[PDB]
């Protein structure tokens, strides 16, 4: 099919959803094989764990706009290239891109990609904020920055920017929805 | 919109046009919030006045390449990270970076910024001289050092490092140009 861009605030259950999807349909979905400038590791295989490039190869890919998204981690670059997305689809699978709002907007400025856009929303900021403090791995500033950045995404979601929006006030229901949408490829 | 880097020798007319643009579009533009290791003084507010951080906060933010620019003032670090410049654009307004030549190069090295480059020129190096005198609050060595950093910047602006060069031989002419550039978003 067409690439499926799935975004939304974390803590909403997006992970369980994608995880359950990838478990239930083990040969049909795929994330894009990411690029890095990080020296390979023991047990990593080029083209499969990562496309390993060089700091200069990565940088020349950035100005050549080959990237959907990229970042710098401790001096190592990461990011996914349009070409690796196509690959997943060349292979006979459906690409899943799990990315932020800024990513959604980038994919959209490449309408040649023809992506699909799915938004996993929390029932409310309240439940999200609370869902967040359930994990237990966070503080004040962290959470607060996590909720401000959600209200932004939520804002972008009210502009009709996505093909579906799934509010997760129940995983099975949402799970059913996530599938009905995916296989409703149009 | 995209971050706009404007530069040019002080005394060109840049400050005036910059103030006019600011008075006419009070809701349109803003500057990033700089970060500092100094302790918040009597009445300051984190996130508004400065992004208050700790020295090691700063230092790793430096190694991890988060700063556009940083300097040291009386024992305390100050700088502009890339996050605060995009904070502006995410917040609905556009970012105006009134930086010098070195600043222009520093931003040109941070591809993730992806900025636009405007440069404001005096009619000649002579007009610069006289106008830097019109304000009269200068000196022999201060007025001279300016004229050198000017031929420098002009030498640089001669290389075509900017998307646009506005000569301020007339303030109404230069004002219309600048707005034409800014609102001729690219």
Curated annotation (Swiss-Prot), chains A, B:
N-acetylserine, modified sites: 1
UniProt cross-references to InterPro entries, sorted A to Z: GK/Ca_channel_bsu (IPR008145), Guanylate_kin-like_dom (IPR008144), Guanylate_kinase (IPR017665), Guanylate_kinase_CS (IPR020590), P-loop_NTPase (IPR027417)
Short name of any one Pfam family annotated for the protein: Guanylate_kin
Keyword Disulfide bond included in the entry's annotation: no
Keywords of the record: Acetylation, ATP-binding, Kinase, Nucleotide-binding, Phosphoprotein, Transferase
Keyword check for Phosphoprotein: yes
Modified residues (Phosphotyrosine): 156
GO molecular function, one term: ATP binding
Gene3D superfamilies: Guanylate Kinase phosphate binding domain (3.30.63.10), P-loop containing nucleotide triphosphate hydrolases (3.40.50.300)
Record-linked SMART domains: GuKc
Residue ranges occupied by any Guanylate kinase-like domain in the UniProt entry: 1-183
This protein's GO CC annotations: cytoplasm; cytosol; nucleus
EC numbers on record: 2.7.4.8
Phosphoserine: residues carrying this PTM: 148
Catalysed reaction equations from the record: GMP + ATP = GDP + ADP
GO biological process, one term: purine nucleotide metabolic process
Residues binding GMP, per UniProt: 34, 38-41, 50, 69, 78-80, 100
Domain of life (superkingdom): Eukaryota
Residues involved in ATP binding: 8-15
NCBIfam families: guanyl_kin (TIGR03263)
Cited function: Catalyzes the reversible transfer of the terminal phosphoryl group of ATP to the acceptor molecule GMP. Essential for recycling GMP and indirectly, cGMP.
Family: Belongs to the guanylate kinase family.
UniProt miscellaneous comment: Present with 20500 molecules/cell in log phase SD medium.
Subunit structure: Monomer.
Name of the molecule in the record: Guanylate kinase
Species name: Saccharomyces cerevisiae (strain ATCC 204508 / S288c) (Baker's yeast)
């Amino acid at each position: 099919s067409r690439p499926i861009v799935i975004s939304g605030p974390s803590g909403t259950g997006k992970s369980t959803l994608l995880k359950k999807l990838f478990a239930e349909y083990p040969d049909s979905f795929g994330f894009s094989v990411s690029s890095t400038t990080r020296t390979p590791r023991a047990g990593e295989v080029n083209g499969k764990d990562y496309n390993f490039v060089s700091v200069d190869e990565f940088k020349s890919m950035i100005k050549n706009n080959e990237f959907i998204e990229w970042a710098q981690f401790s001096g190592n670059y990461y990011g996914s290239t349009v070409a690796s997305v196509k690959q997943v689809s060349k292979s006979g699978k459906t690409c899943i891109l799990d990315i932020d709002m800024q990513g959604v907007k980038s994919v959209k400025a490449i309408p040649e990609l023809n992506a699909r856009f799915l938004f996993i929303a929390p029932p409310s900021v309240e439940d999200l904020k609370k869902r967040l403090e359930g994990r237990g791995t966070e503080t004040e500033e962290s959470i607060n920055k996590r909720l401000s950045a959600a209200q932004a995404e939520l804002a972008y979601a009210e502009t009709g920017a996505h093909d579906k929006v799934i509010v997760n006030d129940d995983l099975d229901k949402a799970y059913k929805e996530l599938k009905d949408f995916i296989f409703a490829e149009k």
